[PDB]
């Protein structure tokens, strides 16, 4: 049980098992610089600011891509919406033009167990989430 690949399958792919705390760790700013199962296990570039996302209660994940203000077509944002209606976003939608949104709605009784991250030396290009 896997999600579609949100964003682009460019760069090298790293795969990570989700930690016991069930949080997704990020470095981000105008886009998503890095992702990982832990703050020390970020894959991607060396930019952005560190933040975390609780993976518990996730109903849907929404990717925002498009023409990046600082060059190229990039994955600039991932927005997590929870069963309680709350929404947390990592990355940004403020530095993109001609943007499109790929939304992935999780099936009932699906837990995120694996992370697949496509990135280069700068930014994260794409992500895929494997379930139970
Ligand atoms: C525009 O700069 C900001 O956003 C990018 C992300 O793409 C980071 O590299 C950088 O550290 C800043 O946070």
């Amino acid at each position: 049980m896997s999600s579609p690949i949100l964003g682009y399958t460019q760069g090298k792919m790293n795969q990570q098992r989700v930690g016991q705390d069930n949080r997704l760790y990020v470095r981000a700013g105008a886009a998503i610089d890095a992702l990982g199962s832990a703050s020390d296990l970020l894959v991607g570039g060396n930019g952005g600011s560190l933040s975390s996302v609780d993976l518990s209660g996730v109903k849907s994940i929404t990717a925002t891509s498009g023409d990046f203000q600082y060059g190229g077509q990039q994955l600039v944002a991932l927005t997590f919406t929870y069963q309680d209606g709350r929404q947390q976003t990592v990355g940004s939608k403020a530095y993109v033009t001609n943007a499109h949104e790929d939304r992935f709605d999780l099936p009932d009784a699906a837990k995120i167990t694996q992370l697949k991250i496509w990135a280069d030396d700068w930014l994260v290009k794409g992500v895929q989430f494997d379930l139970n």
Side-chain angles (χ1 to χ4, degrees), residues 29-31 33 47-48 68 70 123:
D33 300 80
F68 195 30
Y70 299 96
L123 299 174

Side-chain angles (χ1 to χ4, degrees), residues 27-33 46-49 68 70 95 122-123:
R27 276 203 321 263
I32 304 166
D33 300 80
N46 297 123
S49 291
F68 195 30
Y70 299 96
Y95 303 92
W122 197 11
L123 299 174

Side-chain angles (χ1 to χ4, degrees), residues 43-58 60-82 84-85 87-97 99-107:
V43 10
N46 297 123
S49 291
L50 179 61
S51 82
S52 171
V53 159
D54 195 7
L55 286 179
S56 342
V58 171
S60 99
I61 302 173
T62 303
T64 306
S65 21
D67 289 325
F68 195 30
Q69 179 174 323
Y70 299 96
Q73 279 178 351
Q74 312 289 350
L75 180 65
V76 298
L78 284 169
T79 293
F80 299 88
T81 206
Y82 299 88
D84 62 348
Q87 281 183 327
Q88 216 209 333
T89 304
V90 287
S92 187
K93 312 196 200 184
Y95 303 92
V96 63
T97 59
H100 74 288
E101 288 186 350
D102 299 325
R103 179 180 171 195
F104 169 57
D105 296 274
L106 280 77

